[PDB]
Coordinates of C-alpha atoms and ligand atoms in Angstrom, one line a residue:
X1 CA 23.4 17.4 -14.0
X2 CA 23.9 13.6 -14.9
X3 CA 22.2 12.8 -18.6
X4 CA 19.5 10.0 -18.2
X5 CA 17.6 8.5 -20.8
X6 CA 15.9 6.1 -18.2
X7 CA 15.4 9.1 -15.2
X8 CA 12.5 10.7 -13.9
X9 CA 9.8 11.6 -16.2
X10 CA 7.3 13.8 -14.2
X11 CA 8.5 17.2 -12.7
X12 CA 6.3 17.6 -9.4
X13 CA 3.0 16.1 -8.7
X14 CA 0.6 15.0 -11.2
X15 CA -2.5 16.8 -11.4
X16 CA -4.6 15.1 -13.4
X17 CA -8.1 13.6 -12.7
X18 CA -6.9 10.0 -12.1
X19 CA -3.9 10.9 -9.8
X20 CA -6.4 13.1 -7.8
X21 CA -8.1 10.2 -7.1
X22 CA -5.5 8.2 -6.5
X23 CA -4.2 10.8 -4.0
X24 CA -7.8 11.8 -2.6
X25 CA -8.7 8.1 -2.1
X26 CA -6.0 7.9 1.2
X27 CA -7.0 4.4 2.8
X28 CA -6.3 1.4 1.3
X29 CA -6.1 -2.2 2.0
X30 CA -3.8 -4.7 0.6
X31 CA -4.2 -8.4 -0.1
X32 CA -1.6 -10.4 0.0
X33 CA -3.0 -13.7 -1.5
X34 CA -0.9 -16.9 -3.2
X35 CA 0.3 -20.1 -2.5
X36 CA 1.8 -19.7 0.8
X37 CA -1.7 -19.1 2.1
X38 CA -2.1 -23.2 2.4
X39 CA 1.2 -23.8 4.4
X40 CA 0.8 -20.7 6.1
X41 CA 4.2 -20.1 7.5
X42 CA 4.9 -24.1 8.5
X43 CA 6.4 -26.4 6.3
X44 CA 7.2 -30.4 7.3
X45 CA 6.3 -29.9 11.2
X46 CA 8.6 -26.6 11.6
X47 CA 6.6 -23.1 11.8
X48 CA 8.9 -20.5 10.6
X49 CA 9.6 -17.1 11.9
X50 CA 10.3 -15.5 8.8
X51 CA 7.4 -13.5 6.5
X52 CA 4.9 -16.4 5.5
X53 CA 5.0 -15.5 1.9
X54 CA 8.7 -16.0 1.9
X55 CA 8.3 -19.7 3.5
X56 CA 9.7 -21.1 -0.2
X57 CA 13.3 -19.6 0.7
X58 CA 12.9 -20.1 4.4
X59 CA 12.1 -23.9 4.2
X60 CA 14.3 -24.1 0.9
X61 CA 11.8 -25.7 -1.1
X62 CA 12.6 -26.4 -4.5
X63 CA 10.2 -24.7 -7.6
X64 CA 8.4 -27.4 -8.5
X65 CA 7.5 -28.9 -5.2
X66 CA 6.4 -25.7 -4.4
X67 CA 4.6 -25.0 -7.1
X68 CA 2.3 -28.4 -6.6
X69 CA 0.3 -26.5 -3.7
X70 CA -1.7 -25.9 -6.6
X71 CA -3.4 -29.1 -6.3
X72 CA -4.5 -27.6 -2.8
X73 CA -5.9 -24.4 -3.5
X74 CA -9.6 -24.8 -3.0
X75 CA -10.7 -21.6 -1.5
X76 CA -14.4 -22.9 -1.0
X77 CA -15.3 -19.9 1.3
X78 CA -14.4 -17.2 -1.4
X79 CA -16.9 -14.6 -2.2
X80 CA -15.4 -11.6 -4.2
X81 CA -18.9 -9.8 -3.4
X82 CA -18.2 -10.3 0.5
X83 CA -14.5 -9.4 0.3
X84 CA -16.0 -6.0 -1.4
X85 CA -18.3 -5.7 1.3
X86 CA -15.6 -5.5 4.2
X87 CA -13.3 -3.5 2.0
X88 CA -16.5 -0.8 1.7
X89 CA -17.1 -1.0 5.6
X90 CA -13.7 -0.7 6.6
X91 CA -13.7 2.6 4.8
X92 CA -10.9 1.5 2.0
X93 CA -11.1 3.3 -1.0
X94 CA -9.1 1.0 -3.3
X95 CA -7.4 -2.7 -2.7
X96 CA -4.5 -3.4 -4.0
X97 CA -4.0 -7.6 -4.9
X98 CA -1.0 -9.5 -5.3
X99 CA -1.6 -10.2 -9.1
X100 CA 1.8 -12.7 -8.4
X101 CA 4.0 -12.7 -5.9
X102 CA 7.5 -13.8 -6.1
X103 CA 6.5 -17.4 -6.0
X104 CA 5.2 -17.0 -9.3
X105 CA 1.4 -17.9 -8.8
X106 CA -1.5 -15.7 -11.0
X107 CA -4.3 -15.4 -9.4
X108 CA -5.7 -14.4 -13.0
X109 CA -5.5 -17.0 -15.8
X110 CA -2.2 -16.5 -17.3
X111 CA -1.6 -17.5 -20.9
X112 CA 2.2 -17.6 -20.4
X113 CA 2.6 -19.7 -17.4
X114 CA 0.8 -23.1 -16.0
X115 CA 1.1 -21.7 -12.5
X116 CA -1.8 -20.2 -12.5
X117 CA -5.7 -20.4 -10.9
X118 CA -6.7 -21.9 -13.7
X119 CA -4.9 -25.2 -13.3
X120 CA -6.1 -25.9 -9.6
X121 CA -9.4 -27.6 -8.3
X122 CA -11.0 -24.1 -7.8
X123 CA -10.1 -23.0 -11.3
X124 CA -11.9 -19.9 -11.1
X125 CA -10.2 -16.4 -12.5
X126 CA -9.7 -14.9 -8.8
X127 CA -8.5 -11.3 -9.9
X128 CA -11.4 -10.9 -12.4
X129 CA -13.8 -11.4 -9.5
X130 CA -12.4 -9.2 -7.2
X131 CA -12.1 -6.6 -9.9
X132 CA -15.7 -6.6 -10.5
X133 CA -16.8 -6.5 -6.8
X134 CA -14.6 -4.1 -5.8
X135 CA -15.6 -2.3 -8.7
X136 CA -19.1 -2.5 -8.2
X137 CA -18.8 -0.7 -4.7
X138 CA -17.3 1.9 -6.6
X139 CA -13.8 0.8 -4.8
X140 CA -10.7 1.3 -7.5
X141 CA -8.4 -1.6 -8.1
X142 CA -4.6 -1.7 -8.2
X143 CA -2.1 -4.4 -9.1
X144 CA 1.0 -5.2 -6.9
X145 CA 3.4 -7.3 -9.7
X146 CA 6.5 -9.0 -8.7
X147 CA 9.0 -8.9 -11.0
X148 CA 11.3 -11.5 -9.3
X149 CA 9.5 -14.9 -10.4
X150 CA 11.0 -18.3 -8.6
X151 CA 8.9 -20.2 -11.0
X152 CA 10.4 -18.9 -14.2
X153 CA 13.7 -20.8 -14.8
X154 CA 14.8 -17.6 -16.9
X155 CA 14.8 -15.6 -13.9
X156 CA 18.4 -14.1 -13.0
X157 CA 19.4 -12.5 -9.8
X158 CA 22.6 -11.4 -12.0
X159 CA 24.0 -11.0 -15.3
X160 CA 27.0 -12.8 -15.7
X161 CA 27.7 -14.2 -18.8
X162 CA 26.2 -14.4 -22.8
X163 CA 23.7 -17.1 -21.6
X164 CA 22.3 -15.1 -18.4
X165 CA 21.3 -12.1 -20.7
X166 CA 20.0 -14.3 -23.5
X167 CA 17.6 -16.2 -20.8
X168 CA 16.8 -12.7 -18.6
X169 CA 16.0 -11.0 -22.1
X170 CA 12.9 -14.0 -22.4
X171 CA 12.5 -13.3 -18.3
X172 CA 11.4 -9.5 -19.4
X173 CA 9.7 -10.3 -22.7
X174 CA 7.1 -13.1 -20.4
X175 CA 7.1 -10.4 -18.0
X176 CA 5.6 -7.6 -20.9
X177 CA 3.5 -10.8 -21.7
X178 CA 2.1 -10.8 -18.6
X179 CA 1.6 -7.0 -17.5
X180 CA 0.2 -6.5 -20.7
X181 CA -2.6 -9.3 -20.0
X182 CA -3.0 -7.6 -17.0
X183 CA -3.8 -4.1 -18.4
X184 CA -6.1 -5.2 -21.4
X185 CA -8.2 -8.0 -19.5
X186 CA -8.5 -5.4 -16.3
X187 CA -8.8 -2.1 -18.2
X188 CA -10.6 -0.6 -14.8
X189 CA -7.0 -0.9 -13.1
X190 CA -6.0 2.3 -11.6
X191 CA -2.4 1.3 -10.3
X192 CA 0.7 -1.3 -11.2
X193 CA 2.8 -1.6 -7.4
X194 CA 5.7 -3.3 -8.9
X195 CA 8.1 -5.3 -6.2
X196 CA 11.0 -7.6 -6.4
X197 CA 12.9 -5.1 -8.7
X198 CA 15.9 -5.0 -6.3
X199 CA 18.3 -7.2 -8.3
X200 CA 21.2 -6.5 -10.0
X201 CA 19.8 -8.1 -13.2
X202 CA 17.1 -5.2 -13.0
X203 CA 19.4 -2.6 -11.9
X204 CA 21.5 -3.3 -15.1
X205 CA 18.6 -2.7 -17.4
X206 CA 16.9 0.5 -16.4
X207 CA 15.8 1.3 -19.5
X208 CA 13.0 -2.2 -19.0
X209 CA 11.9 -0.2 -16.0
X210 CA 11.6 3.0 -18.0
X211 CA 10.1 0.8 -21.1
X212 CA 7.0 -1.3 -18.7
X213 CA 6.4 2.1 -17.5
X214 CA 5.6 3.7 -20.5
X215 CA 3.7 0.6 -21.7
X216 CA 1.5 0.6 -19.3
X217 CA 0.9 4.3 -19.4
X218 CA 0.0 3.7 -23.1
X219 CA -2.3 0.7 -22.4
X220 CA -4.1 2.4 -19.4
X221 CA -5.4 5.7 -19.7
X222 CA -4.0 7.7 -16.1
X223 CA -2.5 4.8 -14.6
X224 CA -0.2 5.4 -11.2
X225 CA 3.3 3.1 -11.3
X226 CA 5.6 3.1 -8.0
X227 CA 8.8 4.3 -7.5
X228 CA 10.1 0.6 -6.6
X229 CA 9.5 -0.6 -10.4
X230 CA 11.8 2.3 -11.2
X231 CA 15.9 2.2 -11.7
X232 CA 17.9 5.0 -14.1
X233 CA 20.7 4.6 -16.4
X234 CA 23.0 4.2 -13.5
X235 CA 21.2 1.5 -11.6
X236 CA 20.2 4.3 -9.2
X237 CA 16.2 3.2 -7.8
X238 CA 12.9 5.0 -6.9
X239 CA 14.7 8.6 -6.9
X240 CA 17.1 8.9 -10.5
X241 CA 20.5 10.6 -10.8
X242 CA 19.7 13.5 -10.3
X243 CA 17.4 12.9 -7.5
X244 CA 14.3 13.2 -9.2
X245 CA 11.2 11.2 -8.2
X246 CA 10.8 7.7 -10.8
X247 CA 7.0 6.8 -11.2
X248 CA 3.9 8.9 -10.2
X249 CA 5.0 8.3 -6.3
X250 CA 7.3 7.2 -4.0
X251 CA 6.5 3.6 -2.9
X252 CA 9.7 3.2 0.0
X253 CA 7.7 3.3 3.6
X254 CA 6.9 -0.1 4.0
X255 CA 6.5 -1.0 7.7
X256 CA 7.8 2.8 8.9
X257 CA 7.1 6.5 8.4
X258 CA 8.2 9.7 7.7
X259 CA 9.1 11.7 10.8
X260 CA 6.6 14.5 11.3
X261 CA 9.2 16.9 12.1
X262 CA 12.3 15.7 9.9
X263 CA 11.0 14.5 6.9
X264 CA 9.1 17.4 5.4
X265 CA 10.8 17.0 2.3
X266 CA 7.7 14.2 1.6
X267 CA 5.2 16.8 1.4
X268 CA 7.0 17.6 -2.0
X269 CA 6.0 14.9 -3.6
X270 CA 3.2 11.9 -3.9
X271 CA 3.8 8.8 -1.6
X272 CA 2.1 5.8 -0.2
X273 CA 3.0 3.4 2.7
X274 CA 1.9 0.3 3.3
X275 CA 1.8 -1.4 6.7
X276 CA 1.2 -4.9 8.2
X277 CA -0.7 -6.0 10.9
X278 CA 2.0 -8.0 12.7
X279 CA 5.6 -7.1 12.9
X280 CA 6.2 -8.5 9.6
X281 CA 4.1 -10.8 8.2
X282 CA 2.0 -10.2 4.6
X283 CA 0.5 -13.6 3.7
X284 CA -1.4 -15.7 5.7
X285 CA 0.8 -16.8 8.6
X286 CA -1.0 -19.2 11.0
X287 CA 0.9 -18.3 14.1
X288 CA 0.2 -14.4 15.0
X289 CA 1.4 -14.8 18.5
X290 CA 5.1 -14.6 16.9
X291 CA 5.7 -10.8 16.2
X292 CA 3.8 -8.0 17.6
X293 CA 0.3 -7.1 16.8
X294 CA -1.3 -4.0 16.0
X295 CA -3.9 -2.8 18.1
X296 CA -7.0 -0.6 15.8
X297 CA -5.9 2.7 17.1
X298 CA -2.3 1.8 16.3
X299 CA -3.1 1.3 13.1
X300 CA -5.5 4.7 13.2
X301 CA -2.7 6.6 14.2
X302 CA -0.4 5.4 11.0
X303 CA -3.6 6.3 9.0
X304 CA -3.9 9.4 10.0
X305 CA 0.2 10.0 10.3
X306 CA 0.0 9.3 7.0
X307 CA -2.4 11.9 5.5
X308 CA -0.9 14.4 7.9
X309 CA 2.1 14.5 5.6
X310 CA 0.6 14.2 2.3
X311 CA 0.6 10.6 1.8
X312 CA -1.6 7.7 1.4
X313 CA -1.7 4.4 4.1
X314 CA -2.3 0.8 3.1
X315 CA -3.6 -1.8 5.2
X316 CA -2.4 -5.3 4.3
X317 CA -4.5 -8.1 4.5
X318 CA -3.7 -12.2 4.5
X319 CA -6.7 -14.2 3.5
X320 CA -6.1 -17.7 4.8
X321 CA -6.4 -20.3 2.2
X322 CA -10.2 -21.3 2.4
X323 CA -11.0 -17.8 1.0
X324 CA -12.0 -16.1 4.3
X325 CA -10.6 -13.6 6.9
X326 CA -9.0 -14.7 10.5
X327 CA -10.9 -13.3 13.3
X328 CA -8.2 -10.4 13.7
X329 CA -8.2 -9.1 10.5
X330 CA -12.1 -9.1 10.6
X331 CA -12.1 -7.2 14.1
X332 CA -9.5 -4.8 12.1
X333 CA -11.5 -4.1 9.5
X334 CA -14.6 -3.2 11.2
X335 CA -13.0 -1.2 14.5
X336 CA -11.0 0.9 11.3
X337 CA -14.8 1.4 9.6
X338 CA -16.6 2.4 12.7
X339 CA -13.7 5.4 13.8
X340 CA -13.6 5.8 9.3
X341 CA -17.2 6.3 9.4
X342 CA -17.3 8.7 12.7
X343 CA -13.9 10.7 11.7
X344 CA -13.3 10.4 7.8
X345 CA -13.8 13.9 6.6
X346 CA -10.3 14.5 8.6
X347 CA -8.9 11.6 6.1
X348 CA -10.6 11.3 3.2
X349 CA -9.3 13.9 0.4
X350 CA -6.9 15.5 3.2
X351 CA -2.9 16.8 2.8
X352 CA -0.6 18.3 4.9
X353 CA -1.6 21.3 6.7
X354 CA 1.5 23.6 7.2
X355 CA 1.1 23.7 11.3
X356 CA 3.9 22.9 13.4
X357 CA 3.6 19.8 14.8
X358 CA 2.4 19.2 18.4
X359 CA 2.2 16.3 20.9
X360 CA -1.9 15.7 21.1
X361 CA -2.1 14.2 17.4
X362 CA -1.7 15.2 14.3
X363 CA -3.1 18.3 11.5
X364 CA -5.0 17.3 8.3
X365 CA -6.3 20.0 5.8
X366 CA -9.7 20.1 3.8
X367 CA -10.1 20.6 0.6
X368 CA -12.0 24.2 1.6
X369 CA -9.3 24.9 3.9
X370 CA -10.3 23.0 6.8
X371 CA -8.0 22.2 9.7
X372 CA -9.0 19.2 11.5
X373 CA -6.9 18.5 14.7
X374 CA -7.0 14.8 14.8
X375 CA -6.0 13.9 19.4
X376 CA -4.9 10.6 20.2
X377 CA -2.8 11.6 22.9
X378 CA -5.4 13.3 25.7
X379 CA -3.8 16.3 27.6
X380 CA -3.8 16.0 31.3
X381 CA -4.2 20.1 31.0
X382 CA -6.9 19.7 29.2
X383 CA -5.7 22.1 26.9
X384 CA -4.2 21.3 22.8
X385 CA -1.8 23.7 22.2
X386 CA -1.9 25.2 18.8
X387 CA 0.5 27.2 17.5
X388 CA -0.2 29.2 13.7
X389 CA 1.5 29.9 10.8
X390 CA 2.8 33.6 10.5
X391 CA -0.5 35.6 9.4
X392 CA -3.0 32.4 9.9
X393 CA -5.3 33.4 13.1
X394 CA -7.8 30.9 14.4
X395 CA -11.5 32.0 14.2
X396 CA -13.6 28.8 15.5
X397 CA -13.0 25.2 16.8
X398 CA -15.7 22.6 16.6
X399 CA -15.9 19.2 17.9
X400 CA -16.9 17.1 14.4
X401 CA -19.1 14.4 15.8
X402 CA -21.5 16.8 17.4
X403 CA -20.6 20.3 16.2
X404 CA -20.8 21.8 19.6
X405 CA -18.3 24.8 19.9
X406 CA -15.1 24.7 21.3
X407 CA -13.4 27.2 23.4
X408 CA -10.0 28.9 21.8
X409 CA -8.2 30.9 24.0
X410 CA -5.2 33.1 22.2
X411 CA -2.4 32.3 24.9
X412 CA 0.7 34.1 22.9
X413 CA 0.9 35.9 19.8
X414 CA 0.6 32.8 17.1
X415 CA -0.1 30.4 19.9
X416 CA -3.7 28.9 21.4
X417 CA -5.1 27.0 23.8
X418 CA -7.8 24.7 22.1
X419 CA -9.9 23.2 25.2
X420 CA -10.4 19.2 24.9
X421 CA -14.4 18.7 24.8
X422 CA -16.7 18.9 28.0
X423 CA -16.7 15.2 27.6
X424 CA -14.2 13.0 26.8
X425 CA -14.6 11.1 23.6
X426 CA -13.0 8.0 24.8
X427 CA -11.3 7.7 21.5
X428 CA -9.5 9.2 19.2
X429 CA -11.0 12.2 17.7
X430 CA -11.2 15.4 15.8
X431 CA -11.8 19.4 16.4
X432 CA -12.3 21.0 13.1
X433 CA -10.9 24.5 13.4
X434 CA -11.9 27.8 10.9
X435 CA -8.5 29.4 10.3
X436 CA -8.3 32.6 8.5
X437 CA -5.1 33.7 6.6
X438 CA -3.9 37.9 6.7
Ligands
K80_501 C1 13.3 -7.6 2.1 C2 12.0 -7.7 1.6 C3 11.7 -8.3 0.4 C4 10.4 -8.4 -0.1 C5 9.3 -7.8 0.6 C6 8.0 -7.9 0.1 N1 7.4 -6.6 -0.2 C7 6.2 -6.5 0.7 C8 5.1 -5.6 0.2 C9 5.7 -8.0 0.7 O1 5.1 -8.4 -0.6 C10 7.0 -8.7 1.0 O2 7.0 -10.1 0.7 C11 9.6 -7.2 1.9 C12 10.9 -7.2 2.4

């Protein structure tokens, strides 16, 4: 036992009203929205490989040329009301918007900065718009926050003298400035997804981490924070000393997963991934055929992988800069809705069912004890092996689209044949079995 003033505070999951939600919301999307929307990934003639919203450090441009997109943003085809209406029909829950990204943008109408939407032709207060659509279609709202700020000169990757602490001590006092603005004009916020907190300058000073924490909590009845805000005494991050879970949940699967079979150990404890549609690309990047893309039912099966181990999946989003949605992401959002709409009583309000894990797909459990066999990978024997936990017997299968009955056939003691439908769904899909425990 190391002593921490700065460790975890929560022992085990919260179970309070708001983190239920948070936890029985289980799709997101995220929108990653800023500056490097305009440029979008090429800068002077040369497209870059790297992550768009990176293109600053890739194309070494300095802070104030940078900043002077700002004269550019015009985002004439924004709509907050439409952007709420594809979040609702691709079956999202919540959004969670780049508030400001490491670039240093707001896409509300900072007091403490001039980088902001307020100073460009659009002027308009962006974040308060999307709060209130995605609001009004009863969608909740959370904030990613970079810490790391390119545009703030007092900014320090490092502490290494007098004048680097003085200047980083004004760096976290604008930052308070600024989450607190966030919290009191947004009081519906249900979430602060801090990034950009890798630095040894944050690592040093834990006890900030611990501190916007606990202000927020303060400011906003219930709110979730991420692990990734989170360092201990020691500079140790997302998990303290002592290994205990910082934050309400662990924030660390960005772009991967935990295996189903190896990484039980996540079931313990509330998490979230997040996932891009390319290989690696969160803003607006105008050349997809790059990096790899995502197919719907790739993205599905990350969904659903997701829930299966207790978690929650976030689909990122990069609006180009005229406000709108590239053809892709449009196509994403409404091929995830339709299979949402058909098979979302397997996702919605789901956790981790206790089942061994099999090839066919994956387990989900109900709220009434429901398990929901979710098959993306079709057996050429026509048959989805499901083996029980010691004492849990399997009563009933039904297909969910149709509720016609499924055969079960008791192969072993503990194991069973579940027949694939009389017709194959063509898709991905879900048998919804009636266990019953000794
Ligand atoms: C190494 C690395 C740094 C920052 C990131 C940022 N976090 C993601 C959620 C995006 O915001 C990306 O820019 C990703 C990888």
């Amino acid at each position: 036992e190391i002593p921490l003033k700065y460790g975890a505070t929560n022992e085990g999951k919260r179970q309070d009203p708001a983190m239920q939600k948070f936890r029985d919301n289980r799709l997101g999307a995220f929108i990653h929205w800023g500056l490097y929307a305009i440029p979008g990934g090429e800068w002077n003639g040369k497209v870059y490989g790297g992550a768009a919203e990176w293109l600053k450090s890739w194309a070494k441009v300095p802070a104030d040329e940078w900043l002077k997109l700002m004269d550019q943003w015009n985002p004439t085809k924004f709509d907050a009301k439409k952007w709420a209406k594809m979040a609702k029909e691709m079956g999202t829950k919540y959004v969670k918007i780049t508030t400001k990204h490491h670039e240093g943008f707001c896409l509300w109408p900072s007091k403490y900065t001039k980088y902001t939407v307020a100073n460009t032709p659009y002027k308009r207060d962006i974040l308060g718009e999307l709060v209130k659509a995605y609001n009004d279609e009863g969608i909740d709202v959370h904030f990613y926050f970079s810490v790391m700020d390119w545009s703030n000169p007092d900014y320090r990757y490092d502490i290494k003298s007098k004048e680097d602490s003085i200047a980083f001590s004004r760096f976290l006092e604008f930052t308070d400035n600024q989450l607190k603005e966030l919290a009191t004009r947004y009081p519906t916020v249900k979430d602060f997804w801090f990034d950009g907190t890798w630095d040894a300058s944050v690592k040093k000073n834990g006890w900030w981490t611990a501190h916007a924490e606990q202000m927020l909590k303060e400011l906003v009845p219930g709110v979730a924070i991420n692990s990734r805000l989170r360092a201990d005494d020691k500079g140790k991050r997302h998990f303290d000393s002592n290994g205990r879970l910082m934050g309400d949940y662990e924030s660390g699967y960005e772009r991967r997963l935990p295996d189903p079979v190896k990484d039980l150990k996540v079931t313990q404890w509330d998490w979230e991934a997040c996932m891009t549609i390319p290989e690696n690309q969160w803003g607006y990047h105008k050349d997809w055929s790059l990096s790899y893309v995502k197919t719907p039912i790739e993205v599905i099966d990350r969904i659903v992988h997701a829930v299966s181990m207790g978690g929650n999946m976030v689909v990122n989003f990069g609006p180009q800069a005229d406000g709108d949605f590239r053809p892709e992401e449009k196509a994403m959002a409404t091929a995830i809705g339709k299979w949402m709409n058909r098979y979302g009583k397997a996702v919605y309000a789901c956790d981790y069912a206790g089942f061994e894990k099999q090839d066919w797909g994956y387990y989900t459990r109900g709220k009434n004890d429901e398990v929901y066999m979710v098959v993306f990978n079709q057996p050429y024997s026509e048959r989805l092996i499901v083996k029980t936990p010691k004492g849990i017997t399997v009563e009933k299968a039904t297909l969910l689209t149709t509720g016609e009955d499924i055969t079960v056939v008791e192969t072993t003691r503990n194991e069973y044949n579940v027949s694939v439908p009389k017709k194959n769904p063509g898709e991905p899909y879900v048998i919804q079995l009636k266990v019953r425990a000794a």
